[PDB]
Design a protein around this ligand. Structure first.
Ligand SMILES: [Mg+2]
Ligand SMILES: [Mg+2]
Ligand SMILES: [Mg+2]
Ligand SMILES: [Mg+2]
Ligand SMILES: [Mg+2]
Ligand SMILES: [Mg+2]
Ligand SMILES: [Mg+2]
Ligand SMILES: [Mg+2]
Ligand SMILES: [Mg+2]
Ligand SMILES: [Mg+2]
Ligand SMILES: [Mg+2]
Ligand SMILES: [Mg+2]
Ligand SMILES: [Mg+2]
Ligand SMILES: [Zn+2]
Ligand SMILES: [Zn+2]
Lengths: 136, 88, 116, 50, 46, 179
RNA sequence: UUUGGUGCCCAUGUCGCUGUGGAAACACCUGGUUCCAUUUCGAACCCAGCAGUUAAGCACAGUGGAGCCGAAUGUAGCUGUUUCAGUGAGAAUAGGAAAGCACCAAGC
RNA sequence: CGGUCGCCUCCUAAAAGGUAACGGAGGCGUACAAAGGUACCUUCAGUACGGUUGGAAAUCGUAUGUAGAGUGUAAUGGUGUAAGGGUGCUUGACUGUGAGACAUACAGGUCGAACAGGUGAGAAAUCAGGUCAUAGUGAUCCGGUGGUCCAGUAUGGAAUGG
RNA sequence: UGGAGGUAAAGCUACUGAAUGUAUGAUGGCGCCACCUAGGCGUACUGAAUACAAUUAAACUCUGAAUGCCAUUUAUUUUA
């Protein structure tokens, strides 16, 4: 469960996911990568699920990198509460993925297993994923 | 059922102090008119421009106000009042 | 930590900033620069950034560094200022404490018609 | 509110002409300042007045 | 600086074995104080 | 001082010849012997500090200025605005007088002056002497503070190289082991 | 023109490295008896003199090392109307860069 | 029912300003006869080395370091020769005023050239009508206190007012 | 035409936090010895600092627009 160790402000304004890709746009640690095509909020739970899926379908020597990190927190008012009397308390952390950000990358294992691995990683995430390779 | 709700603690704000630039470049000015109000010297004073007890810049003579950029990496701003200088 | 001249330059930067900030009547500025051997004097005008009058031990051809030749330097520069028809002056030191040669030259300038 | 104020009165016409502040806990000694007096039209010693 | 109660007076110093009357400024009694171990009376220096 | 003239003539010629120094003042020159006898006991038994100064006073001929800390520490009971430590800086004739008196009278009286050198230069040419006890200094009567302490005599030089500082020390015969 | 002083400027002006220099001046330097000074020290400030001095500082030449500056193309954001025309960044880069502008005194 | 009611700082506030919510964070109802005024002098914190007590860290010397230091305070802005530190003398922490502006429904608030009187620092130029700036505050009525060139119910006082 | 600003954007070796991998690695945990206290050899592993490559921010900024705002210049229009 990826979680910031501490934050200066518990309840910040939400960060939009509409727009192009600011950073983490090109595979730069591995050479195959899973890009997103629709910005959305995805939480550390989906990240951990996808990472465990990748690790389970990896081998004995494959290596993986997680680019995105759930920096921003979000609140949720308790149920049966009418609006007012302040903001709700923070519940879960989501990493903000914009159209074009490479979330996971893999290397050091043959091509078919990595393609399958990225497929299973992307089926755990709501965004519609796509495979790209690293420029020589 | 309402079940009751907690209480918020920060709904407090102070009156807005009316700071900022008052006379724009090229505007004619007489002595004693405010050119720039600030909290801490955001605009330095030049010639024919004074300072107050609230870091307020005011004119000292007739003329056209004029801003001059100066300082390291061109990060400091300076204002002045170039006198009418009609000089026939 | 530094050398004497740099500290003298530092004091001069303070004095120049102060004079340029408060001299409202645009008086001529009688700058004296003292060295280990000699002391010179020049009257700048901070509105035009030029030199109106000048005087020096080299100009006056004296074995200076004494209070005696300081009297001569003050008299010469005061005579030149009177000839230039400027009498409203501001007096600043080169960054040295106003005393001895600087005080003698400044007082010498005052009895020859200067007002400061 | 706290009352740190004190009154300063002349010592020639015995008129009170100034109002200032003083900490009785820290400063124990009476003020003996010298200020302008409207009546005497000069500078004169002004002392603390109850 | 000056105007002091402790005067630094040039006092001579004698030593055992080797006389070596070294004159050094100090604020003490004005006479030939004899030192028992001086620099020259030490196995380390010579 | 006659040894001051000895310093002038001898140091000039030998160092100049020793390194083919192109100017007589290229040779290193010693500047100031700072003495700093500081103690934190002034936080509680202030009286002691006063006596400290006088002994320091009685040793150098310059009245000591008491120094103040630039911070505050609870564990040491330290607080800003207090006087903890005196520093004296001797120059001109008096500095050579005190230096000569130390090396010739005070130092060889040290219980075991076996010395420490080569491993004392700060890398810029300086030198610090950590004295262990005060009673050994001749300019001190038996009556003193209830606690006895040492000294931190230090040295400065015109040169910036520690090796040239050591060379001056060897030319001056400062008696340390092999240095 | 060069040296010395200074103002304007506020790194393409810096930090550093390597060499050269002094005629006059600038500096270190020589002493504290005078005016003046140390929260203590003629260190500094202040005196009165230039014996020595080119280490410094200072001034020149080289040095692209650090720091600084940074083109064109393209792109992101904007304004309109389009779903295309302008506006155009930041980052990155080729690369520049060993300051510049005036006044005064001296031999020139 | 709980919470809040005046004033100050930041964000939301969309690069002029303004802009709300039981939106998100904090403080204030002060402190300084020096932490004011002037003249002079002076400039980080930290880190590296070297040194008795003394220790990770007290002080000293030297170098490095361009602000992470200080600027009484909650933040913001400003300020490293400054607005920070020290010293000497002082009280302008004045009197009567005040052209002209800002912002404002009003009431109130904020800046201020300049004049007269008499001062402080400083050789002088100059500066000083409280502090680096923004919170530290409550109208009217009523009564009390000091001064006073005004009134004093026929007149002189007094009472009582101004 | 000139200006004020610090948003969009972008960047985090230009700060404050958050934060990924690689390399060198303070540090501890973990051992095994000697030594009762000064310590030492490896560390399933934690991870200061540095270098390389990559990230995040209403209350982060070494930067950084357009629009909008103020004033002025010219042309036209209205007595508001
Ligand atoms: Mg506000
Ligand atoms: Mg040379
Ligand atoms: Mg209620
Ligand atoms: Mg706006
Ligand atoms: Mg605004
Ligand atoms: Mg603050
Ligand atoms: Mg003072
Ligand atoms: Mg102050
Ligand atoms: Mg009533
Ligand atoms: Mg009557
Ligand atoms: Mg943005
Ligand atoms: Mg960052
Ligand atoms: Mg922002
Ligand atoms: Zn009176
Ligand atoms: Zn002997």
């Amino acid at each position: 469960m990826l979680q910031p160790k501490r934050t200066k402000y518990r309840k910040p304004h939400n960060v939009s996911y509409e727009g192009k890709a600011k950073g983490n746009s090109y595979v730069a640690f591995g050479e195959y990568g899973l890009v997103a095509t629709k910005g959305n909020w995805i939480d550390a739970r989906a990240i951990e699920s996808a990472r465990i899926a990748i690790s389970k379908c990896l081998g004995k020597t494959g290596k993986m990198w997680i680019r995105i990190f759930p920096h921003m927190s979000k609140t949720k008012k308790p149920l049966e509460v009418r609006m007012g009397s302040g903001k709700g308390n923070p519940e879960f952390w989501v990493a903000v993925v914009k159209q074009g950000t490479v979330m996971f990358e893999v290397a050091n294992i043959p091509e078919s297993q990595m393609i399958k691995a990225l497929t299973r990683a992307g089926h755990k995430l709501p965004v519609t994923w796509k495979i790209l390779k690293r420029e020589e | 059922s309402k079940k009751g709700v907690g209480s918020t603690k920060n709904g407090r704000d102070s009156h807005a102090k009316r700071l900022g630039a008052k006379k724009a470049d090229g505007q004619m000015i007489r002595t004693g008119q405010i050119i720039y109000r600030q909290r801490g010297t955001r605009v330095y004073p030049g010639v024919n421009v004074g300072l107050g007890s609230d870091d307020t810049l005011f004119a000292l003579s007739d003329g056209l106000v004029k801003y001059q950029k100066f300082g390291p990496k061109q990060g400091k701003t300076r204002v002045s009042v170039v006198k009418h200088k009609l000089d026939a | 930590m530094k050398t004497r001249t740099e500290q003298r330059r530092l004091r001069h930067k303070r004095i120049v900033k102060k004079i340029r900030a408060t001299n409202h009547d645009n008086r001529v500025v009688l700058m004296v620069i003292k060295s280990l051997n000699h002391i010179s004097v020049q009257a700048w005008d901070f509105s035009q950034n030029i030199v109106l009058a000048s005087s020096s031990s080299l100009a006056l051809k004296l074995k200076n560094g004494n209070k005696d030749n300081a009297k001569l330097v003050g008299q010469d520069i005061a005579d030149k200022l009177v000839k230039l028809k400027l009498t409203n002056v501001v007096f600043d030191t080169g960054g040295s404490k106003y005393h001895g040669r600087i005080a003698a030259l400044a007082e010498a300038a005052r009895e020859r018609g200067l007002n400061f | 509110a706290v009352k740190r104020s004190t009154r300063l009165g002349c010592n020639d016409c015995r008129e009170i002409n100034y109002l200032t502040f003083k900490n009785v806990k820290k400063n124990p000694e009476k003020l003996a300042l010298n200020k302008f007096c409207s009546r005497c039209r000069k500078v004169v010693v002004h002392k603390e007045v109850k | 600086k000056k105007d002091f109660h402790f005067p630094s007076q040039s006092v001579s110093f004698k030593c055992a074995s080797c006389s070596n009357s070294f004159t050094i400024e100090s604020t003490l009694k004005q006479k030939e104080i004899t030192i028992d171990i001086c620099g020259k009376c030490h196995p380390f220096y010579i | 001082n006659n040894l001051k003239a000895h310093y002038q003539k001898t140091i000039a010629k030998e160092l100049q010849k020793s390194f083919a120094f192109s100017s007589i003042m290229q040779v290193p020159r010693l500047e100031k012997i700072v003495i700093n006898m500081g103690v934190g006991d002034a936080i509680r038994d202030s009286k002691f500090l006063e006596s400290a100064l006088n002994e320091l006073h009685l040793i150098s001929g310059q009245k000591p200025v008491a120094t103040k800390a630039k911070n505050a520490i609870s564990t040491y009971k330290l607080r800003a605005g207090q006087l903890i430590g005196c520093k004296v800086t001797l120059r001109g004739e008096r500095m050579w007088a005190f230096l000569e008196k130390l090396i010739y009278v005070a130092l060889p009286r040290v219980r075991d002056f076996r010395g420490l050198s080569l491993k004392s230069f700060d890398g810029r040419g300086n030198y610090t002497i950590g004295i262990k006890e005060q009673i050994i200094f001749p300019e001190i009567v038996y009556d003193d503070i209830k606690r006895i302490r040492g000294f931190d005599v230090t040295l400065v030089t015109s040169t910036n190289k520690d090796s040239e500082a050591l060379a001056l020390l060897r030319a001056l015969n400062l008696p340390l082991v092999k240095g």
